[PDB]
């Protein structure tokens, strides 16, 4: 029945999902975790401060050793920071000044860096020559690359401005598998600890699960009402939290396939940049645009703490694998360590 | 006390010195952003030099760095904040687009988009009107009233250019902070680059006076 039948097949079988989700919502998260004792006020102090960068810092990533981190800024310089002793491990001059993402490989030998250019270059940190040079150029994207996170020494996954996501092989430098589900502009990407599934969010207020092996959205979540650019997995991998531009952080589970919590405050009207969980997942940290970074409880949803140590906007923050400390970066070219 | 950390911090000072030299060098160079619809290829080829295109050239002992972002073809909102610290924006529009399809209406929407942008609230805009030769020939045959129902005046380039100048800058809901530097694109060189050179130094002088407290 021409194009009319597809909309009928789309309007219907969409009510089935919401009817299933509504029937499955026996109890809300806030209605069961009431017996959990409150976390209380959380106070963090700037243990270390980094001022090497000379431009607005866009993204950061923590290393496996929980000591080395990668900081990116529009000045065209990649800095490997020794958070323990504050010195700079390496300085990588980037061909493209604009950068929106940076990743540190789990092995630590390689790093990722890309921005407005459709290429997020990969640099080897353990070269025989002792310098840092590009290894592969993933130039198969069309829109601006927003986030590419390292999967392994030979596999990486990228998110670009177009409604596509790509998984590359380092040896060949080609799109092994591609994803095309989002209808907007993918901003942030997160990886499950098991390294088999990953979830990403876009400007269409939807977060979609994808499998690196197969290659197709297994689930989608449309609990938001504005552009989302902050999304990270739970430590256990069965849930994830998503930050949007309407000062709302929503936790989505991988079992009920529906939103399970909405962190929001009346006094906050600014957007969110990056979201990162703790080691145990009890504490959720979100980076807001009002020159301030907030701490929320994953269960009770209370204002555990406020980190307002940055003059400009907190564009990114990260938590180490062991959760020892939290590293945050903003547009003031400064990085702070909170623990 | 330290054993090998002394060499580690020594590397940091050597690294930090390099960024400070690189940062100072980057500060000496000035950055400009190109915005337009369709019209801009001739502009970048007058200012003698996939994703975005970055062009570097020097004029009168001043390092000019230009950014071509019109080929992104993506959502402008999510990356326009990267150009917050740009000195000036080179907005190039085609005057002949009034006879093609509505095109100039999109340019005004684009011009209104970045004139009122929060990140661009302190950045001057340089307006370029291309197709000067094309406009001269085709303005006598077609009426400018096609895209300007309210306009009523003589069919003449002098009146036609003035109304375009009246309409464009009118879209600047910040007549104090911004400064629109309109110009007419000429096929011959040594004049378009002169206007761009004179444009930036005006912004820096105003920016310097703003820091000094004069403006």
């Amino acid at each position: 029945s021409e194009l009319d039948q597809l909309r009928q097949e789309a309007e219907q079988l969409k009510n089935q999902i919401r009817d299933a989700r509504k029937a499955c919502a026996d109890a809300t998260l806030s209605q069961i975790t009431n017996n959990i004792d409150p976390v209380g006020r959380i106070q963090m102090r700037t243990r270390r401060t980094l001022r090497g960068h000379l431009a607005k810092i866009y993204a950061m990533h923590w290393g496996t050793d929980s000591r080395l981190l990668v900081s990116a800024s529009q000045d065209g310089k990649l800095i490997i920071w020794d958070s323990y002793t504050t010195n700079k491990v390496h300085a990588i001059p980037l061909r493209s000044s604009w950068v929106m993402t940076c990743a540190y490989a789990p092995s630590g030998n390689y790093v990722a860096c890309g921005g407005l250019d459709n290429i997020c270059s990969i640099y080897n940190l353990k070269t025989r020559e002792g310098n840092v040079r590009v290894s592969r150029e993933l130039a198969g994207h069309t829109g601006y690359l927003s986030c590419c996170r390292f999967l392994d020494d030979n596999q990486i996954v990228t998110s670009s401005g177009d409604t596509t996501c790509a998984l590359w092989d380092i040896e060949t430098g080609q799109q092994t598998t591609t994803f095309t589900g989002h209808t907007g502009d993918v901003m942030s990407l997160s990886l499950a600890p098991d390294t088999r599934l990953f979830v990403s969010g876009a400007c269409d207020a939807s977060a979609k699960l994808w499998d690196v092996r197969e290659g197709m959205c297994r689930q989608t979540f449309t609990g938001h009402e504005s552009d989302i650019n902050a999304i990270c997995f739970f430590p256990n991998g069965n849930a994830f939290a998503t930050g949007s531009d309407d000062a709302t952080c929503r936790l989505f589970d991988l079992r009920a396939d529906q939103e399970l919590m909405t962190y929001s405050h009346d006094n906050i009207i600014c957007g969110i940049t990056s979201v990162s969980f703790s080691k145990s997942g009890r504490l959720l940290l979100a980076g807001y645009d009002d020159f301030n970074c907030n701490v929320w409880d994953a269960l009770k949803a209370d204002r555990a703490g406020v980190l307002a140590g940055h003059d400009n906007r907190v564009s990114c923050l990260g938590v180490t694998d062991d959760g020892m400390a939290v590293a945050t970066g903003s547009w003031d070219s400064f990085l702070k360590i909170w623990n | 006390l330290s054993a090998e950390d002394k060499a580690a911090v020594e590397r940091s000072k050597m690294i930090d010195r390099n960024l400070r030299e690189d940062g100072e060098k980057a500060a000496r160079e000035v950055k400009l952003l190109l915005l337009g619809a369709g019209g801009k290829s001739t502009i970048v080829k007058q200012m003698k030099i996939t994703g975005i295109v970055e062009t570097h050239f020097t004029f009168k002992d001043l390092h000019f760095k230009m950014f071509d972002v019109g080929a992104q073809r993506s959502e402008r909102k999510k990356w326009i904040h990267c150009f917050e610290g740009v000195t000036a924006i080179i907005f190039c529009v085609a005057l002949s687009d009034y006879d093609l399809v509505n095109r100039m209406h999109e340019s005004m929407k684009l011009f209104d988009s970045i004139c009122n942008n929060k990140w661009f609230t302190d950045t001057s805009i340089i307006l370029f009107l291309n197709k000067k030769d094309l406009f001269e020939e085709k303005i006598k045959k077609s009426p400018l009233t096609i895209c300007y129902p309210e306009y009523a005046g003589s069919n003449t380039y002098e009146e036609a250019a003035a109304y375009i100048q009246c309409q464009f800058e009118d879209l600047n809901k910040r007549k104090d902070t911004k400064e629109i530097y309109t110009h007419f694109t000429c096929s011959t060189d040594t004049k378009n680059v002169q206007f761009v050179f004179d444009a930036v130094t005006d912004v820096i002088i105003k920016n310097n006076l703003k820091d000094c407290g004069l403006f």
Partner: single-chain antibody
């Protein structure tokens, strides 16, 4: 990646001589340099060190002030000028490139070296257990070394390095910081110790594993050397 040294030979005592080392295949400017010497009958001995940026320059106690070391990054050449050298200065001289950061591999490459012949405290001594030990292929051999001062630094990193010197070949780096292995080193080599007594174990020794074992130190800066253990097939 090559380190070609020149300027050695026979020099009358009390004279002046300049040794030039040319570095290729790697960033010479970003790498600090070390000049060391090995006596024909004794082990290796540290001589001098220059930083990557020519900021910090250090010398051995025996050759302090006497020697001069400089680097030319645009020419990519390391110049070591020695004046008024005595009869005890005759040795084979080596140049080692080292970079210092977290997870780095200092002393990873070793120069070919040049012979130099002449016509006739506050330091920690590595008390090596023995100077030689017989080995056989297919067997695991463990060597032991001792230091007069504990190398357990306050940061939790122990600064001891192991070096393999094949007969007639430049020394190679086996284990750095007593806990990790350099690139190209077979996984059979392992290190252990409590910060004062150290043990290097090799499993399934091969013909290419023969050579001399040398232990270094980095907790302080005398840069002393051990006697060395000779392996017999």
């Amino acid at each position: 990646v090559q380190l070609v040294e020149s300027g050695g030979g026979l020099v009358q005592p009390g004279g002046s001589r300049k040794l030039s080392c040319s570095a290729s295949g790697f960033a010479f400017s970003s790498f600090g340099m070390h000049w060391v010497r090995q006596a024909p009958e004794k082990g290796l001995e540290w001589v001098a060190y220059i930083s990557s940026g020519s900021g910090t320059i250090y010398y051995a106690d025996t050759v302090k002030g006497r020697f001069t070391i400089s680097r030319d990054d645009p020419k990519n050449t390391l110049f070591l000028q020695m004046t008024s050298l005595r009869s005890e200065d005759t040795a084979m001289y080596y140049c080692v490139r080292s970079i210092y950061y977290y997870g780095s591999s200092p002393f990873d490459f070793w120069g070919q070296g040049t012979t130099l012949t002449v016509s006739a405290s506050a330091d920690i001594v590595m008390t090596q257990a023995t100077s030689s030990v017989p080995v056989t292929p297919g067997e695991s051999v463990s060597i032991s070394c001792r230091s007069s001062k504990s190398l357990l630094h306050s940061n939790g990193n122990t600064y001891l390095y192991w070096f393999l010197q094949r007969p007639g070949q430049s020394p190679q780096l086996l284990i750095y910081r007593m806990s990790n292995l350099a690139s190209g080193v077979p996984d059979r080599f392992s290190g252990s110790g409590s910060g004062t007594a150290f043990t290097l174990t090799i499993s399934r020794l091969e013909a290419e594993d023969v050579g001399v074992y040398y232990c270094m130190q980095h907790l302080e800066y005398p840069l002393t050397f051990g006697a060395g253990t000779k392996l017999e097939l």
